[PDB]
Design a protein around this motif. Sequence first.
Motif, short mmCIF file in Angstrom:
data_model
loop_
_atom_site.label_atom_id
_atom_site.label_comp_id
_atom_site.label_asym_id
_atom_site.label_seq_id
_atom_site.Cartn_x
_atom_site.Cartn_y
_atom_site.Cartn_z
N UNK A 155 0.81 -1.20 0.00
CA UNK A 155 0.00 0.00 0.00
C UNK A 155 0.85 1.25 0.00
N UNK A 156 2.17 1.09 -0.17
CA UNK A 156 3.09 2.27 -0.21
C UNK A 156 2.70 3.13 -1.42
N UNK A 157 2.46 4.42 -1.18
CA UNK A 157 2.06 5.37 -2.25
C UNK A 157 3.29 5.83 -3.06
N UNK A 158 3.04 6.34 -4.27
CA UNK A 158 4.10 6.92 -5.13
C UNK A 158 4.20 8.41 -4.79
N UNK A 159 5.40 9.02 -4.70
CA UNK A 159 6.64 8.42 -5.20
C UNK A 159 7.44 7.61 -4.16
N UNK A 160 6.91 7.48 -2.94
CA UNK A 160 7.61 6.74 -1.85
C UNK A 160 7.93 5.31 -2.30
N UNK A 161 7.13 4.74 -3.21
CA UNK A 161 7.28 3.35 -3.66
C UNK A 161 8.49 3.18 -4.58
N UNK A 162 9.04 4.21 -5.15
CA UNK A 162 10.20 4.01 -6.01
C UNK A 162 11.43 3.68 -5.25
N UNK A 163 12.30 2.81 -5.79
CA UNK A 163 13.52 2.49 -5.09
C UNK A 163 14.39 3.68 -4.73
N UNK A 164 14.44 4.72 -5.54
CA UNK A 164 15.34 5.83 -5.30
C UNK A 164 14.91 6.70 -4.12
N UNK A 165 13.68 6.60 -3.69
CA UNK A 165 13.10 7.48 -2.64
C UNK A 165 13.06 6.73 -1.33
N UNK A 166 13.41 7.42 -0.24
CA UNK A 166 13.27 6.85 1.10
C UNK A 166 11.81 6.92 1.51
N UNK A 167 11.21 5.76 1.74
CA UNK A 167 9.80 5.63 2.11
C UNK A 167 9.67 5.55 3.61
N UNK A 168 8.96 6.50 4.21
CA UNK A 168 8.90 6.66 5.69
C UNK A 168 7.49 6.37 6.19
N UNK A 169 7.36 5.32 6.99
CA UNK A 169 6.14 5.01 7.66
C UNK A 169 6.07 5.69 9.04
N UNK A 170 4.91 5.55 9.68
CA UNK A 170 4.63 6.25 10.94
C UNK A 170 4.43 5.29 12.08
N UNK A 171 5.11 5.59 13.19
CA UNK A 171 4.82 4.97 14.49
C UNK A 171 4.22 6.03 15.41
#
Lengths: 266, 4
Positions: A155-171
């Motif tokens: 369910x990771x949204x774009x552009x976070x889903x691209x390999x080049x981008x650091x995808x940050x989830x929330x705690x």
Amino acid sequence: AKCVSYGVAQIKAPALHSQGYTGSNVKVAILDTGIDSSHPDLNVAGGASFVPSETNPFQDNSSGGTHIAGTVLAVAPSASLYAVKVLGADGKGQASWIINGIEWAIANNMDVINMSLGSPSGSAAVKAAVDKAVASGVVVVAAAGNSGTSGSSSTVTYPAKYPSVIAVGAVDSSNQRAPFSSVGPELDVMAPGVSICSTLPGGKYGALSGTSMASPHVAGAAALILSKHPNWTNTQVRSSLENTATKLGDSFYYGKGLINVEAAAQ
Amino acid sequence: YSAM
Ligand SMILES: [Cl-]
Ligand code: NA
Ligand code: NA
């Protein structure tokens, strides 16, 4: 930061502040709804709007960009903020505006880009722009998405889903994944994203939640790291953050875990 | 695209 937030301590930023590192000489572009530069607690070094109906990047008619800017400065009090308006007051924007913001950030020598925004569907043209920013040396950080879970599907949204981008989830403040935080193998790290108090337009303050709030903790962490290690590449900054994160559980839900900027910065 |  005038308003108290647990998130700064949670990522171990005070250890860097105690060391004397505050993100000096780091340019961070906030690609969002604008930044209210009139807020007494925010200085904005420059910017640009790409939203034709909302021509001033130094106002914010949504509130997110202003809040995000404040979180970057809470983590990295000396960072230089740039307001790049790519979303309107409703929080929505088009691919092409985002691209124009990324291009501006490259032309203006930004060190870090924060994109607290997402789409379920990718743009091939945005992918090209984010890939070029990373190839040029920029640390690109994005919200992983607020789309919860979908069984075994990402369910990771774009552009976070691209390999080049650091995808940050929330705690949350207990280091538990927030119910809204997107999931999948594309998830890199987590940061605080529940009830984060920061700056709001009109000289105000308040709590907001989202992966939008998690992302700027990581953008600010990048600025702290660069102030300690101004010679590191974006590759090295990213590696530091991912390889020193505090593991919190299965990587599908948590990535490498909670960023630890004290460990990342050595 | 939407704000997160
Ligand atoms: Cl995209
Ligand atoms: Na907003
Ligand atoms: Na990614």
